[PDB]
Amino acid sequence: MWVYRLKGTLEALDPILPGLFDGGARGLWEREGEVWAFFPAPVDLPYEGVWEEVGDEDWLEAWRRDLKPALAPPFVVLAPWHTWEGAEIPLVIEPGMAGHHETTRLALKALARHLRPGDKVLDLGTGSGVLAIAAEKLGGKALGVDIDPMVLPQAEANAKRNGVRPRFLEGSLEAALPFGPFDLLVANLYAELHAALAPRYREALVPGGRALLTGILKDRAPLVREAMAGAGFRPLEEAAEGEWVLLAYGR
């Protein structure tokens, strides 16, 4: 698809608009002093505007513009360019490819409840590092691990913008134990993997430590309940949003 970028406002260009539709324009977007006309392909136009084919970049970039703050009491997730006039705790997460998922939200909310200032936290499957950052904002000391190294520079970049500095490390539970035990572990994964890690979870946490598990589809919540009960944990709390569930356990 091609874009015909013109300078001016819609109100301003309103005259020559009719001619763009004739020329077969199927879309028009006023974007910061410029009017963008969309065509399947370039045509001949006396408007002396510039042509350019639309790419993924442009989409994401456009997606980036429609992005709105996300509430997750006591936090608000924001784009480095967002402005918030509230009393909620700000989290700035560059929309990069590595915080609007229902599970992240349940995680944040649960973290605020189970995290105490001075707690050592393990963000298992840190991704953007958002939860990691959140824990520091609550006064905790955190470690973020992920088997995917691709995400680690972004996470650290994110921490930076949030004026906080968690420890980030490529790996999984095992990569983490040397920095434990921890007071709390927060894991946004999936029901079956939790079920398999249940036993290693209790070894990562000091007695009384907390385990916050999310990324759980409602229809698979039973697997975690059983895995955790058997791993010796005790249920503490349950939260859901859509088809997603978060389960809180105490060791």
Ligand SMILES: Nc1ncnc2c1ncn2[C@@H]1O[C@H](CSCC[C@H](N)C(=O)O)[C@@H](O)[C@H]1O
């Ligand atoms: N076994 C494993 N150990 C560590 N990270 C894992 C893992 N399996 C998947 N992941 C990582 O899990 C992350 C899940 S999504 C990241 C979500 C973020 N912590 C939040 O709360 O929203 C991904 O970044 C993925 O790379």
